[PDB]
Amino acid sequence: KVGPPLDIKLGALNCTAFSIQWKMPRHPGSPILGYTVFYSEVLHSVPLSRDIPTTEEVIGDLKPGTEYRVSIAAYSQAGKGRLSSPRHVTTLSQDSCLPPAAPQQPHVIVVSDSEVALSWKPGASEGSAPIQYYSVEFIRPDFDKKWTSIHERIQMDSMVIKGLDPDTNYQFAVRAMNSHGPSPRSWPSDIIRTLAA
Ligand SMILES: *[C@@H]1O[C@H](CO)[C@@H](O[C@@H]2O[C@H](CO)[C@@H](O[C@@H]3O[C@H](CO)[C@@H](O)[C@H](O)[C@@H]3O)[C@H](O)[C@H]2NC(C)=O)[C@H](O)[C@H]1NC(C)=O
């Protein structure tokens, strides 16, 4: 019986998601218990549906550059309310949610038996959003089959890495992050050996 939700607002967040916001229906006969959100790809087709207690929601795991038809209905103690007029929204184009290009191959200079100096430059593009931080991985080519992450974020374009094994060959690589995610790895640095203990 109750009217459809009012003041619906939707915006594409990124390539795979959009957020939806609305107001309580006017003059409800009974307390609103929740809402039901219906959406389908874009002549109507059978839609997916999500039930939520609040007046706003984020709809994720969508396809890039695709238009969606969205409707909302409120449910109360007297059944399902009237369904709002359909709203359309398009997820961002893939070129628009790009993560940054891989940073340039880093320069490496041995410092001690357990330390190494390292520096890098950003890539040709920051992607679709400015770089927020860098990440650094390392690997011992003689024994390791996989890269190891350094669980810190760097706003500098250089750093000194400590705690390495003495008399060991190492290589290093860098990735840049924006709000859209990680870049590919930089080229690996040239092999460099720590001083023996
Ligand atoms: C595009 O937008 C969507 C929606 O904002 C992003 O997905 C969301 O990513 C966040 C952060 O990773 C997720 O939050 C996390 O959820 C669980 C606990 O519920 C846990 O992994 C973390 O503690 C954190 O709270 C959120 O669930 C997720 N929402 C989805 C998938 O619907 C997405 O990362 C954005 N970027 C891209 C490139 O798609």
Coordinates of N, CA and C and ligand atoms in Angstrom, one line a residue:
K1 N 0.8 -1.2 0.0 CA 0.0 0.0 0.0 C 0.9 1.3 0.0
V2 N 1.9 1.2 0.8 CA 2.8 2.4 0.9 C 3.4 2.8 -0.4
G3 N 3.6 4.1 -0.6 CA 4.2 4.6 -1.8 C 5.7 4.2 -2.0
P4 N 6.2 4.4 -3.2 CA 7.6 4.0 -3.5 C 8.5 4.9 -2.7
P5 N 9.8 4.5 -2.5 CA 10.8 5.3 -1.9 C 11.0 6.6 -2.7
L6 N 11.4 7.7 -2.0 CA 11.5 9.0 -2.7 C 13.0 9.4 -2.7
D7 N 13.3 10.4 -3.6 CA 14.6 11.0 -3.6 C 15.7 10.0 -3.8
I8 N 15.6 9.1 -4.8 CA 16.6 8.1 -5.1 C 17.7 8.7 -5.8
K9 N 19.0 8.3 -5.4 CA 20.2 8.9 -5.9 C 21.2 7.7 -6.2
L10 N 21.7 7.6 -7.4 CA 22.7 6.5 -7.7 C 23.8 7.1 -8.5
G11 N 25.0 6.6 -8.2 CA 26.2 7.0 -8.9 C 27.2 5.8 -9.1
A12 N 27.8 5.7 -10.3 CA 28.8 4.6 -10.5 C 30.0 4.9 -9.7
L13 N 30.4 4.0 -8.9 CA 31.6 4.1 -8.0 C 32.9 3.8 -8.8
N14 N 32.9 2.7 -9.6 CA 34.0 2.3 -10.4 C 33.5 1.4 -11.5
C15 N 34.5 0.6 -12.0 CA 34.1 -0.3 -13.1 C 33.2 -1.4 -12.7
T16 N 33.1 -1.8 -11.4 CA 32.4 -3.0 -11.0 C 31.3 -2.7 -10.0
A17 N 31.0 -1.4 -9.7 CA 30.1 -1.1 -8.6 C 29.4 0.3 -8.8
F18 N 28.3 0.4 -8.1 CA 27.6 1.7 -8.0 C 26.9 1.7 -6.6
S19 N 26.6 2.9 -6.1 CA 25.9 3.1 -4.8 C 24.6 3.7 -5.1
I20 N 23.6 3.3 -4.2 CA 22.2 3.7 -4.3 C 21.8 4.3 -2.9
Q21 N 21.0 5.4 -3.0 CA 20.6 6.2 -1.8 C 19.2 6.6 -2.0
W22 N 18.3 6.5 -1.0 CA 16.9 6.9 -1.1 C 16.4 7.4 0.3
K23 N 15.2 8.0 0.2 CA 14.4 8.5 1.3 C 13.2 7.6 1.6
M24 N 12.8 7.6 2.8 CA 11.6 6.9 3.3 C 10.4 7.4 2.5
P25 N 9.5 6.5 2.1 CA 8.3 6.8 1.4 C 7.4 7.8 2.2
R26 N 6.7 8.7 1.5 CA 5.9 9.7 2.2 C 4.6 9.1 2.8
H27 N 4.2 9.6 3.9 CA 3.0 9.2 4.6 C 2.8 7.6 4.7
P28 N 3.8 6.9 5.2 CA 3.6 5.5 5.3 C 2.5 5.1 6.3
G29 N 1.8 4.1 5.9 CA 0.7 3.6 6.8 C 1.2 2.8 8.0
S30 N 2.3 2.1 7.8 CA 2.9 1.3 8.9 C 4.4 1.5 8.8
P31 N 5.1 1.2 9.9 CA 6.6 1.4 9.9 C 7.3 0.6 8.8
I32 N 8.2 1.3 8.2 CA 9.0 0.6 7.1 C 10.0 -0.4 7.8
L33 N 9.9 -1.6 7.4 CA 10.8 -2.7 7.9 C 12.1 -2.8 7.1
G34 N 12.2 -2.4 5.9 CA 13.3 -2.5 5.0 C 13.0 -2.2 3.6
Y35 N 14.0 -2.4 2.7 CA 13.8 -2.1 1.3 C 14.3 -3.3 0.5
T36 N 13.8 -3.3 -0.8 CA 14.3 -4.3 -1.7 C 14.7 -3.6 -3.0
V37 N 16.0 -3.9 -3.4 CA 16.6 -3.2 -4.6 C 16.7 -4.3 -5.7
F38 N 16.1 -3.9 -6.8 CA 16.1 -4.8 -8.0 C 17.0 -4.1 -9.1
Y39 N 17.8 -4.9 -9.7 CA 18.7 -4.4 -10.8 C 18.9 -5.5 -11.9
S40 N 19.0 -5.1 -13.1 CA 19.2 -6.0 -14.2 C 20.0 -5.2 -15.3
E41 N 20.7 -5.9 -16.2 CA 21.5 -5.3 -17.2 C 20.6 -4.7 -18.3
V42 N 21.1 -3.7 -18.9 CA 20.3 -3.0 -20.0 C 21.2 -2.9 -21.3
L43 N 12.6 -2.4 -22.6 CA 12.7 -3.9 -22.6 C 13.4 -4.4 -21.3
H44 N 12.6 -4.8 -20.3 CA 13.0 -5.3 -19.1 C 13.4 -6.8 -19.2
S45 N 14.2 -7.2 -18.2 CA 14.7 -8.6 -18.1 C 14.5 -9.0 -16.7
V46 N 14.6 -10.3 -16.4 CA 14.5 -10.7 -15.0 C 15.7 -10.2 -14.2
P47 N 15.4 -9.6 -13.0 CA 16.5 -8.9 -12.3 C 17.0 -9.5 -11.1
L48 N 18.2 -9.2 -10.6 CA 18.7 -9.6 -9.3 C 18.1 -8.7 -8.3
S49 N 18.1 -9.2 -7.0 CA 17.4 -8.4 -6.0 C 18.2 -8.6 -4.7
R50 N 18.2 -7.4 -3.9 CA 19.0 -7.3 -2.7 C 18.1 -6.7 -1.6
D51 N 18.0 -7.3 -0.4 CA 17.2 -6.8 0.7 C 18.1 -6.2 1.8
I52 N 17.7 -5.0 2.2 CA 18.6 -4.3 3.1 C 17.8 -3.5 4.1
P53 N 18.3 -3.2 5.3 CA 17.6 -2.5 6.4 C 17.7 -1.0 6.3
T54 N 18.8 -0.5 5.6 CA 19.1 0.9 5.6 C 18.5 1.6 4.3
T55 N 18.7 3.0 4.3 CA 18.3 3.8 3.2 C 19.3 4.0 2.1
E56 N 20.4 3.2 2.2 CA 21.5 3.3 1.1 C 22.2 2.0 1.0
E57 N 22.9 1.8 -0.1 CA 23.5 0.5 -0.4 C 24.6 0.7 -1.5
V58 N 25.5 -0.2 -1.5 CA 26.5 -0.3 -2.6 C 26.3 -1.7 -3.3
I59 N 26.2 -1.6 -4.6 CA 25.9 -2.8 -5.4 C 27.2 -3.1 -6.2
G60 N 27.9 -4.2 -5.8 CA 29.2 -4.5 -6.3 C 29.2 -5.7 -7.3
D61 N 30.4 -6.0 -7.7 CA 30.7 -7.2 -8.6 C 29.9 -7.1 -9.9
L62 N 29.9 -5.9 -10.5 CA 29.2 -5.7 -11.8 C 30.2 -5.7 -12.9
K63 N 29.7 -5.7 -14.2 CA 30.5 -5.7 -15.3 C 30.9 -4.3 -15.7
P64 N 32.1 -4.1 -16.3 CA 32.6 -2.7 -16.7 C 31.8 -2.2 -17.9
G65 N 31.6 -0.9 -17.8 CA 31.0 -0.1 -18.9 C 29.6 -0.7 -19.3
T66 N 28.8 -1.0 -18.3 CA 27.5 -1.6 -18.6 C 26.4 -0.9 -17.9
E67 N 25.3 -0.7 -18.5 CA 24.1 0.0 -18.0 C 23.2 -0.9 -17.2
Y68 N 22.7 -0.5 -16.1 CA 21.8 -1.2 -15.2 C 20.6 -0.5 -14.9
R69 N 19.5 -1.2 -14.8 CA 18.1 -0.7 -14.5 C 17.9 -1.0 -13.0
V70 N 17.6 0.0 -12.2 CA 17.5 -0.1 -10.8 C 16.1 0.4 -10.4
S71 N 15.5 -0.4 -9.5 CA 14.2 0.0 -8.8 C 14.3 -0.4 -7.4
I72 N 13.4 0.3 -6.6 CA 13.4 0.1 -5.2 C 11.9 -0.1 -4.7
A73 N 11.7 -1.0 -3.8 CA 10.4 -1.1 -3.1 C 10.6 -1.3 -1.7
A74 N 9.7 -0.7 -0.9 CA 9.8 -0.8 0.6 C 8.9 -1.9 1.0
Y75 N 9.3 -2.7 2.0 CA 8.4 -3.6 2.7 C 8.1 -3.2 4.1
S76 N 6.8 -3.4 4.5 CA 6.3 -3.0 5.8 C 5.5 -4.1 6.4
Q77 N 4.9 -3.9 7.5 CA 4.0 -5.0 8.1 C 2.9 -5.4 7.2
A78 N 2.4 -4.4 6.4 CA 1.3 -4.7 5.4 C 1.9 -5.0 4.0
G79 N 2.9 -5.9 4.0 CA 3.3 -6.4 2.7 C 4.3 -5.5 2.0
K80 N 4.6 -5.8 0.7 CA 5.5 -5.2 -0.1 C 4.9 -3.9 -0.7
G81 N 5.6 -2.8 -0.6 CA 5.1 -1.5 -1.1 C 5.3 -1.3 -2.6
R82 N 4.8 -0.2 -3.1 CA 4.8 0.1 -4.5 C 6.3 0.3 -4.9
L83 N 6.5 -0.1 -6.2 CA 7.9 -0.2 -6.7 C 8.2 1.2 -7.4
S84 N 9.4 1.7 -7.1 CA 9.8 3.0 -7.7 C 9.9 2.9 -9.2
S85 N 9.9 4.1 -9.8 CA 10.2 4.1 -11.3 C 11.6 3.7 -11.5
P86 N 11.9 3.0 -12.6 CA 13.2 2.5 -12.8 C 14.2 3.6 -13.1
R87 N 15.4 3.5 -12.5 CA 16.5 4.4 -12.7 C 17.7 3.6 -13.4
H88 N 18.4 4.3 -14.3 CA 19.5 3.7 -15.0 C 20.8 4.3 -14.6
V89 N 21.9 3.4 -14.6 CA 23.2 3.8 -14.2 C 24.2 2.9 -15.0
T90 N 25.3 3.5 -15.3 CA 26.3 2.8 -16.1 C 27.6 2.7 -15.3
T91 N 28.2 1.5 -15.1 CA 29.5 1.4 -14.5 C 30.6 2.0 -15.4
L92 N 31.7 2.4 -14.8 CA 32.7 3.1 -15.5 C 33.3 2.3 -16.6
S93 N 33.7 3.0 -17.6 CA 34.5 2.3 -18.7 C 35.8 1.8 -18.2
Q94 N 36.3 0.7 -18.8 CA 37.6 0.1 -18.3 C 38.7 1.1 -18.4
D95 N 38.8 1.9 -19.5 CA 39.9 2.9 -19.6 C 39.9 3.9 -18.5
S96 N 38.8 4.0 -17.8 CA 38.6 5.0 -16.7 C 38.8 4.5 -15.3
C97 N 39.0 3.2 -15.1 CA 39.4 2.6 -13.8 C 40.7 2.0 -13.8
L98 N 41.6 2.5 -14.7 CA 42.9 1.9 -14.9 C 43.8 2.2 -13.7
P99 N 44.5 1.1 -13.2 CA 45.6 1.3 -12.2 C 46.8 1.9 -12.9
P100 N 47.8 2.5 -12.1 CA 49.0 3.1 -12.8 C 49.8 2.1 -13.6
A101 N 50.6 2.7 -14.5 CA 51.6 1.9 -15.2 C 52.6 1.5 -14.2
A102 N 53.3 0.4 -14.6 CA 54.4 -0.1 -13.7 C 55.5 0.9 -13.6
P103 N 56.0 1.2 -12.4 CA 57.1 2.1 -12.2 C 58.3 1.6 -12.9
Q104 N 59.2 2.5 -13.2 CA 60.5 2.1 -13.9 C 61.3 1.2 -13.1
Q105 N 62.1 0.4 -13.8 CA 63.0 -0.6 -13.2 C 63.9 0.2 -12.1
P106 N 63.9 -0.3 -10.9 CA 64.6 0.4 -9.8 C 66.1 0.2 -9.9
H107 N 66.8 1.3 -9.4 CA 68.2 1.3 -9.2 C 68.6 0.7 -7.9
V108 N 69.6 -0.1 -7.8 CA 70.0 -0.8 -6.6 C 71.5 -0.6 -6.3
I109 N 71.8 -0.3 -5.1 CA 73.2 -0.1 -4.6 C 73.4 -0.8 -3.3
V110 N 74.4 -1.7 -3.3 CA 74.7 -2.4 -2.0 C 75.2 -1.5 -1.0
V111 N 74.7 -1.7 0.3 CA 75.1 -0.8 1.4 C 76.0 -1.6 2.4
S112 N 75.6 -2.8 2.7 CA 76.3 -3.6 3.8 C 76.0 -5.1 3.5
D113 N 76.5 -5.9 4.5 CA 76.1 -7.3 4.5 C 74.6 -7.6 4.6
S114 N 73.9 -6.7 5.3 CA 72.5 -6.8 5.5 C 71.6 -5.7 4.9
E115 N 72.2 -4.8 4.1 CA 71.4 -3.6 3.7 C 71.7 -3.4 2.2
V116 N 70.7 -2.7 1.6 CA 70.7 -2.4 0.2 C 70.0 -1.0 0.0
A117 N 70.5 -0.2 -0.8 CA 69.8 1.0 -1.2 C 69.0 0.8 -2.5
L118 N 67.9 1.5 -2.6 CA 67.0 1.2 -3.8 C 66.2 2.5 -4.1
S119 N 66.0 2.7 -5.4 CA 65.3 3.9 -5.9 C 64.6 3.6 -7.2
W120 N 63.5 4.4 -7.4 CA 62.7 4.1 -8.6 C 62.0 5.4 -9.1
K121 N 61.5 5.4 -10.3 CA 60.7 6.4 -10.9 C 59.3 5.9 -11.3
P122 N 58.3 6.7 -11.3 CA 57.0 6.3 -11.7 C 57.0 6.0 -13.2
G123 N 56.0 5.4 -13.7 CA 55.8 5.0 -15.1 C 55.3 6.1 -16.0
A124 N 55.0 5.8 -17.2 CA 54.6 6.8 -18.2 C 53.2 7.3 -17.8
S125 N 52.4 6.6 -17.1 CA 51.0 7.0 -16.7 C 50.8 6.7 -15.2
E126 N 50.0 7.6 -14.6 CA 49.5 7.3 -13.2 C 48.2 6.5 -13.3
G127 N 47.7 6.1 -14.5 CA 46.4 5.5 -14.6 C 45.2 6.6 -14.6
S128 N 44.1 6.2 -14.0 CA 42.9 7.1 -13.9 C 42.8 7.9 -12.6
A129 N 43.8 7.7 -11.7 CA 43.8 8.4 -10.4 C 45.2 8.5 -9.9
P130 N 45.5 9.5 -9.2 CA 47.0 9.8 -8.9 C 47.5 8.7 -8.0
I131 N 48.8 8.4 -8.1 CA 49.5 7.4 -7.3 C 49.4 7.8 -5.8
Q132 N 49.0 6.8 -5.0 CA 48.9 7.1 -3.6 C 50.1 6.6 -2.8
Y133 N 50.7 5.5 -3.2 CA 51.9 5.0 -2.5 C 52.6 3.9 -3.5
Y134 N 53.8 3.5 -3.1 CA 54.5 2.5 -3.8 C 54.6 1.2 -2.9
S135 N 54.8 0.1 -3.5 CA 55.1 -1.1 -2.8 C 56.4 -1.8 -3.4
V136 N 57.1 -2.5 -2.6 CA 58.4 -3.1 -3.0 C 58.4 -4.6 -2.6
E137 N 58.9 -5.4 -3.6 CA 59.1 -6.8 -3.4 C 60.6 -7.2 -3.7
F138 N 61.0 -8.3 -3.1 CA 62.4 -8.7 -3.3 C 62.4 -10.3 -3.5
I139 N 63.5 -10.8 -4.1 CA 63.6 -12.2 -4.4 C 65.1 -12.5 -4.4
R140 N 65.4 -13.7 -3.9 CA 66.7 -14.3 -4.0 C 66.8 -15.2 -5.2
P141 N 67.4 -14.8 -6.4 CA 67.3 -15.7 -7.6 C 67.9 -17.1 -7.4
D142 N 68.8 -17.3 -6.5 CA 69.4 -18.6 -6.3 C 68.5 -19.6 -5.7
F143 N 67.6 -19.2 -4.8 CA 66.8 -20.1 -4.1 C 65.3 -19.9 -4.2
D144 N 64.8 -18.6 -4.3 CA 63.4 -18.3 -4.2 C 62.7 -18.4 -5.5
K145 N 61.5 -19.1 -5.5 CA 60.7 -19.1 -6.7 C 59.6 -18.0 -6.8
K146 N 59.5 -17.3 -5.7 CA 58.4 -16.2 -5.6 C 59.0 -15.0 -5.0
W147 N 58.3 -13.9 -5.3 CA 58.6 -12.6 -4.7 C 58.1 -12.5 -3.3
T148 N 58.8 -11.7 -2.5 CA 58.4 -11.5 -1.1 C 58.0 -10.0 -1.0
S149 N 56.9 -9.7 -0.3 CA 56.4 -8.4 -0.2 C 57.0 -7.7 1.1
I150 N 57.3 -6.4 1.0 CA 57.6 -5.6 2.2 C 56.4 -4.9 2.6
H151 N 55.9 -5.2 3.8 CA 54.5 -4.8 4.2 C 54.5 -3.4 4.7
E152 N 55.1 -2.5 3.9 CA 55.0 -1.1 4.2 C 54.7 -0.3 2.9
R153 N 54.1 0.8 3.1 CA 53.7 1.7 2.0 C 54.7 2.9 2.0
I154 N 55.2 3.2 0.8 CA 56.2 4.3 0.7 C 55.6 5.4 -0.2
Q155 N 55.7 6.6 0.3 CA 55.5 7.8 -0.5 C 56.7 8.4 -1.1
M156 N 57.9 7.9 -0.7 CA 59.2 8.3 -1.3 C 59.4 7.4 -2.5
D157 N 60.3 7.9 -3.4 CA 60.7 7.1 -4.5 C 62.0 6.4 -4.3
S158 N 62.4 6.3 -3.0 CA 63.6 5.5 -2.6 C 63.5 5.1 -1.2
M159 N 64.3 4.1 -0.8 CA 64.3 3.5 0.5 C 65.6 2.6 0.6
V160 N 65.8 2.3 1.9 CA 66.9 1.3 2.2 C 66.3 0.1 2.8
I161 N 66.6 -1.1 2.3 CA 66.0 -2.3 2.7 C 67.1 -3.0 3.6
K162 N 66.7 -3.4 4.8 CA 67.5 -4.0 5.8 C 67.2 -5.5 6.0
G163 N 67.9 -6.2 6.8 CA 67.6 -7.5 7.2 C 67.8 -8.6 6.2
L164 N 68.5 -8.3 5.1 CA 68.7 -9.3 4.1 C 69.8 -10.3 4.5
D165 N 69.9 -11.4 3.8 CA 70.9 -12.4 4.1 C 72.3 -12.0 3.6
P166 N 73.4 -12.2 4.3 CA 74.7 -11.8 3.8 C 75.1 -12.7 2.6
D167 N 75.9 -12.1 1.7 CA 76.6 -12.9 0.6 C 75.5 -13.6 -0.2
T168 N 74.4 -12.9 -0.5 CA 73.3 -13.4 -1.3 C 72.9 -12.6 -2.4
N169 N 72.6 -13.2 -3.6 CA 72.1 -12.4 -4.7 C 70.6 -12.0 -4.5
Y170 N 70.3 -10.8 -4.9 CA 68.9 -10.3 -4.7 C 68.5 -9.5 -6.0
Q171 N 67.2 -9.5 -6.1 CA 66.6 -8.6 -7.1 C 65.4 -7.9 -6.5
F172 N 65.0 -6.8 -7.0 CA 63.9 -6.0 -6.3 C 63.0 -5.5 -7.4
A173 N 61.7 -5.3 -7.0 CA 60.7 -4.7 -8.0 C 59.8 -3.9 -7.2
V174 N 59.1 -3.0 -8.0 CA 58.3 -1.9 -7.4 C 56.9 -1.9 -8.1
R175 N 55.9 -1.6 -7.3 CA 54.5 -1.4 -7.9 C 54.0 -0.1 -7.3
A176 N 53.2 0.6 -8.1 CA 52.5 1.8 -7.7 C 51.0 1.6 -7.6
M177 N 50.4 2.2 -6.6 CA 49.0 2.0 -6.3 C 48.2 3.3 -6.4
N178 N 47.0 3.3 -6.9 CA 46.1 4.3 -6.8 C 44.8 3.8 -6.2
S179 N 43.7 4.6 -6.2 CA 42.4 4.1 -5.7 C 41.9 2.9 -6.5
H180 N 42.4 2.7 -7.8 CA 41.9 1.6 -8.6 C 42.7 0.3 -8.5
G181 N 43.8 0.3 -7.7 CA 44.5 -0.9 -7.5 C 46.0 -0.9 -8.0
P182 N 46.6 -2.1 -7.8 CA 48.1 -2.1 -8.1 C 48.5 -2.2 -9.5
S183 N 49.6 -1.6 -9.8 CA 50.2 -1.6 -11.1 C 50.8 -3.0 -11.3
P184 N 51.2 -3.4 -12.6 CA 52.1 -4.5 -12.8 C 53.4 -4.2 -12.1
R185 N 54.2 -5.2 -11.8 CA 55.5 -5.1 -11.3 C 56.4 -4.3 -12.3
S186 N 57.3 -3.4 -11.7 CA 58.4 -2.9 -12.5 C 59.3 -4.1 -13.0
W187 N 60.1 -3.8 -14.0 CA 61.2 -4.7 -14.3 C 62.0 -5.0 -13.0
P188 N 62.5 -6.3 -12.9 CA 63.3 -6.6 -11.7 C 64.6 -5.8 -11.8
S189 N 65.1 -5.4 -10.7 CA 66.4 -4.7 -10.6 C 67.5 -5.8 -11.1
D190 N 68.6 -5.2 -11.4 CA 69.8 -6.1 -11.8 C 70.2 -6.9 -10.5
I191 N 70.7 -8.1 -10.7 CA 71.2 -8.9 -9.6 C 72.3 -8.2 -8.9
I192 N 72.2 -8.2 -7.6 CA 73.2 -7.6 -6.7 C 73.4 -8.5 -5.5
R193 N 74.6 -8.6 -5.0 CA 75.0 -9.4 -3.9 C 75.3 -8.6 -2.7
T194 N 74.8 -9.0 -1.5 CA 75.1 -8.4 -0.3 C 76.6 -8.8 0.1
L195 N 77.2 -7.9 0.9 CA 78.6 -8.2 1.3 C 78.5 -9.4 2.3
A196 N 79.6 -10.2 2.3 CA 79.7 -11.3 3.2 C 79.9 -10.8 4.6
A197 N 79.4 -11.6 5.6 CA 79.5 -11.3 7.0 C 80.9 -11.6 7.5
Ligands
LIG1 C1 35.0 -0.9 -6.7 O1 34.0 -0.7 -5.8 C2 33.7 -1.8 -4.9 C3 32.6 -1.4 -4.0 O2 33.0 -0.2 -3.2 C4 35.0 -2.3 -4.2 O3 34.7 -3.6 -3.5 C5 34.8 -3.4 -2.1 O4 36.1 -3.4 -1.6 C6 36.2 -3.2 -0.1 C7 37.6 -3.1 0.2 O5 38.4 -4.2 -0.2 C8 35.5 -4.4 0.6 O6 35.5 -4.2 2.0 C9 36.0 -5.3 2.6 O7 35.1 -6.4 2.9 C10 35.5 -7.5 3.7 C11 34.6 -7.5 5.0 O8 33.2 -7.3 4.6 C12 37.0 -7.5 4.0 O9 37.7 -8.1 2.8 C13 37.6 -6.1 4.4 O10 37.8 -6.1 5.8 C14 36.8 -4.9 3.9 O11 35.9 -4.5 4.9 C15 34.0 -4.5 0.1 O12 33.4 -5.6 0.6 C16 34.0 -4.5 -1.4 N1 32.6 -4.5 -1.9 C17 32.1 -5.2 -2.9 C18 33.1 -6.2 -3.5 O13 31.0 -5.2 -3.3 C19 36.2 -2.5 -5.2 O14 37.4 -2.8 -4.5 C20 36.3 -1.3 -6.0 N2 37.5 -1.4 -6.9 C21 37.5 -2.2 -8.0 C22 38.8 -2.1 -8.8 O15 36.6 -2.9 -8.3

